């Protein structure tokens, strides 16, 4: 997806390989980039949110809740991911669409919320638009927008009982929140180079990742609950090889890039998820920043 | 004559005294010149042209640009320079280590990927521009060639509008701070910027078969910190619309270095985003 | 069904089609017949990607899958292999009605393709249909839907045993021609002319249910008459496999 | 479609059972297999000689002889020239195509290809690409095609069994194992054999939950979480980790154990994989 | 035009833009065929030795399903045996056949997606394609003519129906399609239904020794050439 | 493959001739090619020829279960897949910009014109509805397919006859032609397409029926669909060089005249065919 | 005769030198293939595994599929007497056909589609093609079939002759 | 009279430019409750003239009913063709023969006049992107208050119709390069009498003039603030 030169990649890998990871941004490994977001961006949508990164990418999510004829729980919710310029069937788009759905349907509590009555259920439509061209891996931003959107989602209050077809007050200000203030799941693209664990990686950083995980978490530091982990195929594997100065290389030559040839060391996987779930960690930082957005 | 912004379809002048220029067009049935873009009317030697508010890089002969190669074609590379179309780099326009000496030139045409491959970065000079606007690059000067030992960042006036501009020189070497040592900077007029440790084969100047090998020389941590610091500085300028130029970068770098020294996090911290980034700009615009 | 390297897996999955969902449906007297009017048989051939080099994902698609599907479909109907009488689902209260039809989705997948696909494919279809054991289904007037027993199954009354035999002509072009039975993938690439012969011998007299010669002129009336004997021999040997 | 013999115009209904007796349904399946023992893997190599390398994998549904469940056919296609629309790639391009057999499709007539088929491709692609040496064969591509002949549970029935995700993890574990067998058969430079292990945290009673290797959701009253792992025992590396389930961060130990047993399942599966490959040559 | 007329009726150059074309109608079936002379083959089918022959069949109504895909293969294989494909190694030859009319089966409601082989239409398609190839001037080893025989059985006797209507085909005990080259060799022999080899051979005779399509092809082609070579004098 | 282009000599000359008010075909700028409309022996077959442009179109009705866009509604569809017979440039199963617009303009014309009584089509609600499919076959493409196709489509649909049906004791009986005489498809008003083309660099030259060669030279076009009574069923000047609104109003004003004679022809031609069926 | 599995440890890099079918990892040498181990034992002993790609300098046999006045495009079938399970396109540029008078030689006079050429790989090429040179006595056409379709024989280095039709044809004969 | 609006009266048209920093050109456009956001790639290499590629994304939430839109894939492909041809009628594509211009349009909300909004949003982005244009390709809708069946001579054409009006009344979309009468796009899918057409076109053209004043004003307000600072 992303394109970089081997010599450019070799510098990035070496810099992040140092004991204190010297990220190209100068950012701390625990530190996210600045976040700009909006809620209720689209009127007439039960929940909507916009998010734009310092990277320039932006995404908009809108939530439509429609009463449908069915404590009861079924995967009524459907997620759509509109990426500009894709064939509507690409690997990345469908993988993301399933991944975000996996997070919400992971506990199944979320399905329960959308249960108007035993006879009728709220079929929830989540439409995710990547406003910007896919300059970098959208997953982090899309997840944060979905988190913000669901938080902003309000559900029509039910004047009618359940056995009769449901009837709802019409005031959006009367309608109570979905996920009223468990939280909607956040998901962090976590990356590893050597023993260093990196969060919110830039496309340049992610291009040299030895390991990349999409970790979905929620809260009820905060009382975190792990929901899913998926291994993002390190884009580093698809990069060109480095050419040493004047066949199988016997030695890891300094400054010569070489795609990570194996899998993730077993311990690193524990380290990547351990650091995600540590109390007061990145998840708390993300939720603190996210929950500070007006709703 | 930039009193106010002229807009597309807006009549600039009707008199025939003027030749048209970029950003303007003449309806075939009249002498009138009409602006094609939203921009400022520029008048020189009775030629009228409109500089657009924002437009992609348009190359001029002699421009020193940084671009990454996107394609390999018959005796040619297509180089992305942020222009309207990929710049061309003829195989004859690069400094082969011994293209004449090897007598391998017939072999060379087939093995172009030994010199540059898709994604490889280079610093080159525009030796010509076609009528369609595509530039033709040349890399025969020893300071031109594949870029190594550095980091790449793209500037396109994101948010701040202002970006890279033509200057006295587009390449310089800074001593660096915290014993980083000589580190080069390349301000590609096309908006691409390259920051790397200085080397004798590098583009910079201290204040051949391996030339195309993608092996970085060893780089120490402090060197990478400063290289990262400069990259943060450049983004700080762009994110606040400041002129990105060697003079304004050195000012920012020194300000950033001293900012880190007085910062409680110590000279080691290199972060410059957000409010701290604006703080640098405020101290830099003064 | 394995025939050398060629390997076909046929799966017959029956699904119930309510008559209220069938355009052109009429209560039978007990048209093209129910099988064709209602499309009760739905054979589809999957030349599974990578089953042979010619079916690699990057190689342009070819019509072979479609042609075999219709070849099977027409032969499946013309042979009258399955009778609509078996696929009817009756109410028969205690005013009889047909409430739905069993729809046989006869899916084939070429796990390995080493030439001569139709012979293997047809054999799999016949073998699978003979094996088919649909669940006994009945109309539930209280639930107003067709329901099926969890244990009782009714087997299809497959009539006859049409066995497909195929061969290809290899030409030295005295224009010597060699008739190659069961052409291997490689042999098909070299033999432009192919013949397919579907015969049924359950009557003890060969009955040709279908012939498909094409791609050349070597196979005159004499060879085709001779080939009918070859197909009968092929029927005899295959009969001993599809017990 | 133009390319397939369309069934009847009406939407056909899958068989719905009479369900005459609730009593007949009686007891719920209980995992007799020890918590640390995988299903019996049947693995064969060279099943499609036309391909450069191939393998076939089959599992007993509930460790019962003759009761076959998952069935996977894999045909690696050997490094082959890349299409000319994208004629160059510095690294060998591993391309994974996974398709449910029409017999195994969720819908006998389907408007849309299962998202599940695309998803399994990405997981398997990530798992195998880590285990395959791309540097060896530049300018070339290798295509791993998985045909899911049969799922451990019927697709339309799986909808009733809590969640298909658990089945997908079982399917992915098989895909990793069989694909590795095919890759070894095809002689594709691989860093190590990769086998697909899967483990689950389950709670079949009011007592504390157990960690169970190679689960099947029907055998358990509640799967709290599960993990699928493409693991390289000779490297002690994981090329594709997949986990799902609500686990409190306080239960980080359980997750760690869950992954470890999932890796243990991968080792167990790899044992069969090496045995099959050893006897193949 | 209609089924009752014994005489085949044909035209050539029906479609002007096409390299060659022909509109042929017989026994109630009308098909209009356009042939494009060797042209740029899409790299997919650029055989190194011989021209690729690409037969395309379009039904009168509905989209071309699997049925047509078979007809295209049947005609593609046979015509590749007729055309001198070796003469245009890398070229392509388009043969688009458009079924303009077939006898409407009054006893069945319209079904467009039917996927069964339609032997009924094979002769009309083959003849029209043959005429179009002759019109296009594509080099060929020999001409070829196709005939359809339906072996209906009535009472205790078997009845040969020549060029039957599709209604006759579905009522027929068996149906046969023979395509004999000008050398009297057999080119296609597609058949279906229950029949003994004796019955097939009997039909082979009926289709081969009989409207004299060989003469019809020659006569119509003579008229066309005589018309446009009238200048020669 | 990509469409073949005329040589710049042809491009310049055609533009030059139009500026002289002359066309290579000898027709005036506001003149159509000789229009021939032929009806096939089977009901619903119509064969329109605009000089060298021939468009065969066959209507068909099959009772089908209603789902999706018309879940209980009864649905009329148009299929106009172009084929190499149209031109080698076209490829099977490969829609093109020409085909997509052609289909789009036809379906909008027939549907938005309200010509068909869709409520009449549904034999049963949500179970069985008549589906009226009309297949358009472009036998020869010499420009103005959108116009030739429209006449063929409406001619076919007006010529087409449904199988008769009857509801008895709630039982829907659909009668084959042998059982009952097919009933003509009810048809309120007949829309007709007219496709102007514009050539001047300012779009000041308007041509009524473009040859294929002209269509390669034109800088814009504007399809107009109208009833005999002047009701415009659609207008589609989908971009191209702009044209003064007065010109378009002139184009529509002329188009109504051409539509009237098209309507008279189809009515006359249907009457002539009717006598062949019933002398 | 020792069978090795993918990822099986072969030994430390200090004892062996990685050969085909092996890969290094943390200063240790492992087998990347399922196959038998072999040690060259020539410096350190090279170790390899045997269960293929064209390479510069290799002699390949290929089939001509299309010819252009500039280059003839061939399909590579055999590399070093080893048939290739998958095929690669190669280009024989007109310069690369003959050792001398490279300006005078024409592709039409050297090879034509369908014949089999034995060529030497000159370079891994840009895009999808290799670059092969037949400019050597041992290189050129091996199997040729006349326009008439008969299998020809090399009458002289310049031309093949037909045994049935008798006609000669100009082609780049391989001398042996 | 129309609810809360005059017959010859646009709805509140509010637009923004340089809405997204990443895009070479970006625009946001609101026409009443119809919201369209557009991001235009600057001409860049992806032959006689630059290709203009338009991708329209209609969000499910933007539609009042998910079922109503029903994917509408044919509709979207037609709209992309309309807009692409519309913009190319003005963009000086001949200046970038070997490049492509990509316009991405996101329909965040629909309240009728969608095609007009899409064209307007595209031009704003194209002007933002600095693409040389002959003139604003402004678009607007207009539809007779009387139905074609009603045939009321007294009735006069409306402007900037709401979605409800588009269901009830004959309506048209006219896009005119510049303030000029000449029309780049004239899409009138609804049935209308020819007598009514002249009035609707005349009103529609005037609407385009009003929209252009808004659009040009929006461009200058951004332009002035830029020259004021760089």
Numbering used by the authors:
A (entry chain E): 8 to 77, 114 to 224, 241 to 279, 308 to 333, 364 to 412
B (entry chain H): 57 to 263, 280 to 358
C (entry chain C): 73 to 102, 112 to 175, 200 to 278, 288 to 357
D (entry chain F): 3 to 283
E (entry chain D): 3 to 212, 236 to 258
F (entry chain A): 2 to 280
G (entry chain I): 6 to 47, 68 to 76, 95 to 219
H (entry chain B): 14 to 59, 87 to 270
Question: What are the paper's exact sentences on this?
Answer:
We determined the structure of Exo9 from the eukaryotic thermophile C. thermophilum (ctExo9) by X-ray crystallography to 3.8 Å resolution and by cryo-EM to 3.2 Å resolution. The general architecture of ctExo9 is identical to that of yeast and human exosome complexes. Despite this wealth of structural information, several disordered regions are invisible in these structures. In particular, an extended loop region in Rrp42 (Rrp42-EL) and the entry loop in Rrp41 are largely unresolved, while the shorter exit loop of Rrp41 is only partially visible. To initiate the MD simulations of the open state, all missing loops of the here obtained cryo-EM structure were modeled using the ColabFold implementation of AlphaFold2. The closed state was obtained by interactively modeling Rrp42-EL into the unoccupied cavity near Rrp41, a location that agrees with our NMR data. Finally, an analysis of the RNA channel within the representative MD simulation structures illustrates that the closed conformation of Rrp42-EL blocks the exit site of the RNA channel in the exosome core, whereas the RNA exit channel is unobstructed in the open state. The global analysis of dynamics and PRE data revealed that in Exo9 the invisible Rrp42-EL adopts the closed (open) conformation to 5 ± 1% (95 ± 1%) and that the open to closed transition takes place at a rate (kex=kopen→closed+kclosed→open) of 5800 ± 1400 s-1. The order parameter (S2) of the open conformation (~ 0.1) is significantly lower than of the closed conformation (~ 0.7), revealing that the loop in the open state is highly flexible, whereas it is stably fixed to the rest of the exosome complex in the closed state. Rrp42 in C. thermophilum thus contains a previously unidentified flexible one-way-plug that readily allows for passage of substrate RNA via the through-channel route but that prevents access to the Rrp44 active site via an aberrant direct path.
